[PDB]
A paper describes a structure:
Rai1 homologs share several highly conserved sequence motifs, and our structural studies show that they are located in the active site region, mediating the binding of the divalent metal ions and/or the RNA. The overall structures of CaRai1, AgRai1 and SsRai1 are similar to those of SpRai1 (16), KlDxo1 (18), and MmDXO. Each structure contains two mixed β-sheets that are surrounded by α-helices.
Similarly, one of the terminal oxygen atoms of the 5′ monophosphate, the scissile phosphate of the substrate, is a bridging ligand to both metal ions. Therefore, the RNA is bound as a product of the reaction, and hence its nucleotides are numbered U2 through U5, while nucleotide U1 would be the leaving group of the substrate. The side chain has weak electron density and assumes different conformations in the two CaRai1 molecules in the asymmetric unit. The presence of the negative charge and the larger size of the side chain could interfere with the binding of the substrate through electrostatic and steric repulsions. The phosphate of U4 has ionic interactions with the side chains of Lys263 (αF, motif V) and Arg284 (β13, motif VI), while that of U5 has ionic interactions with Arg284 (motif VI) and Arg159 (αD).
Residue numbers in the entry: 0 to 390
The structure:
Amino acid sequence: HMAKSLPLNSRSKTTALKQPRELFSYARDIDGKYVYDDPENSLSYYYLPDSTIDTGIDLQGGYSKFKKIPDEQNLADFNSLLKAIIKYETSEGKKISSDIITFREIMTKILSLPYNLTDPIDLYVVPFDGQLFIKSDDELDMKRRKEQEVRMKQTNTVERYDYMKRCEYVGYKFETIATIPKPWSQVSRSQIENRNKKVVNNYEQYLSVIRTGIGNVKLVLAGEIDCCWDYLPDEQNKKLNHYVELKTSRIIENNSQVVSFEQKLFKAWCQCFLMGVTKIIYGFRDNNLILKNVELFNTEEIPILIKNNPLTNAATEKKINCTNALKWYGAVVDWLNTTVDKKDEIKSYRLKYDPVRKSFTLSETDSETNEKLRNGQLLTPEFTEWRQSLK
RNA sequence: UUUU
Ligand SMILES: [Mn+2]
Ligand SMILES: [Mn+2]
Ligand SMILES: [Mn+2]
């Protein structure tokens, strides 16, 4: 049926960037249950001395005891985010002011789209109480994840497939061996030393909810935070400044590896720029998954590093440029903000990037889909009642 | 989280 499309070459004229600020946080515990009071108790702190790095940490250590959340249980959870929002807004006596409320991974997909043209995007947009609630199409995502899985099983040897699954584990192991549950001053020597034996899980999470903007649009983004650098300030407008994102990558050996590392680093920049995270730490590991060295990047410096790398030139259309991405992102969110009637709660929309047709479109959902979205699948009855109560 |  009919759909409105934004041309893929659309770009905002300038870049008016607002500084992000954390509004509140919440957490997920080791059993997968969300926590809304004293969530700061779930924030870890970065701690990884060179002397420890020198020992040659095995990042596949403990792979067989990995406590891994099933993928079906690890989708972005609007229920819990809305519950966190009701708690905050009840304290403030007022709704959060924003045009869009969503998860950061969703905007990361949009922002990085210009240099990741083969990757699909399928989202749902639900207007409610003067705001746009945006979530991913869970069913399509799971279907793509399953089909990616079966590809990778079929097309790689048993050895390569096992290695790739171990590489998935490596990311979480690095987080485990590079962080401590409290700042250096409150942690004991045992805790520090025993990290390499701790059971690794990906259940526990600390989530920041931030307000930010671009152009004249306001966005609230929920995103998971890997750790805190030194201490968490009490000053609300400074909390984001102390967060850190962790990554792992293979040590780099040829120019092929250099362009791939540029691509990953851009995606890391996308994720951290949106969230106000100022530090990205890479754990570089070898073929046997031993950690070899660690490097800190300042988020704000990444655009310069990318623009000035003598090894990674390409045609202007293919060369990653952070400013160009930001102008595409700004065009998208302004389009969403002026196209959809935020006051019409009678329907919902699919927002889709289709790489085969090269199109970026908004179309109305089916009545049954709108109903599901508004009665549990995105909006919850507790949240709708809360918002109706303020008016 | 993750593949040179
Ligand atoms: Mn984690
Ligand atoms: Mn993370
Ligand atoms: Mn990370």
